[PDB]
């Protein structure tokens, strides 16, 4: 598999998705992770916010410009978690970190592609439903990310365009079913071949 693997970050848990992404990107496999503002973290919003604010407190007090850089965008927060799971002080880890690319929302080389899902990092699979969780977008916005309103409006536009394309696809599928019902008498010879070998229940 030589193509790019495009994952949708919405509904996924941060560290589990980061671990999967890190092993893939070390094994090769250019990975794009879109919609990093939809990533979930387990534990309630307040204690996740406190963890981030303790991280914000960590600062080189001789030169904070030299010190640890606290990125605010959810894409860069996810990227830094994968960076923490990578061996980034080596050329191999740096090549993997370059092989990874992250985005807030879905930019338009990827809004017209199929996004995959990692069920081993999904919130509905890995958390009990009676447990609190947080949103990376809300957490980022309250620790100082500037761009959650523009991302929301652009995502609304993208969702409208996707609804239009999906209605086109549904009309095409209805036409294809109608065409099968029309010319079934000349594909009956070929249909029974496929039914015999397990295609076409």
């Amino acid at each position: 598999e030589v193509q790019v693997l495009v994952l949708d970050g919405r509904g996924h848990l941060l560290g589990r998705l980061a671990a999967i992404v890190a092993k893939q990107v070390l094994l090769g496999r250019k990975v794009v992770v879109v919609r990093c503002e939809g990533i979930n973290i387990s534990g309630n919003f307040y204690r996740n916010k406190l963890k981030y604010l303790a991280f914000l407190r960590k600062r080189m007090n001789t030169n904070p410009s030299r010190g640890p850089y606290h990125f605010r965008a959810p894409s860069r927060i996810f990227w830094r978690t994968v960076r923490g799971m990578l061996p980034h002080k080596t050329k191999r880890g740096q090549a993997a970190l370059d092989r990874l690319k992250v985005f807030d929302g879905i930019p338009p080389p990827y809004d017209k592609k199929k996004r995959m899902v990692v069920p081993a990092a999904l919130k509905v699979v890995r958390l009990k439903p009676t447990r609190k969780f947080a949103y990376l977008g809300r957490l980022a916005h309250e620790v100082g990310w500037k761009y959650q309103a523009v991302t929301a409006t652009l995502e609304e536009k993208r969702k409208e365009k996707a609804k239009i394309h999906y209605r086109k696809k549904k009309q095409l599928m209805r036409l294809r079913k109608q065409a099968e019902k029309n010319v079934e008498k000349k594909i009956d010879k070929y249909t029974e071949v496929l039914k015999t070998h397990g295609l076409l229940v």
């Binding site: 007090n61 001789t62 030169n63 904070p64 410009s65």
Partner: protein, 49 residues
């Protein structure tokens, strides 16, 4: 400045006073009240200021 930091942060911090450039600085001052807007040197005839 007689002392620049303690022994043991082992570095001069960014927050002690050092010598260097003074002035030629970009500043943004607010709440400056306009008292009058002038009108320039118009010529109707033998002109008027």
């Amino acid at each position: 400045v007689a002392c620049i930091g303690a022994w043991h942060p082992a570095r001069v911090a960014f927050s002690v006073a050092r010598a260097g450039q003074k002035g030629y600085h970009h500043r943004t001052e607010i709440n400056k009240k306009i008292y009058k807007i002038g009108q320039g040197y118009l010529i109707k005839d033998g002109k008027l200021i």
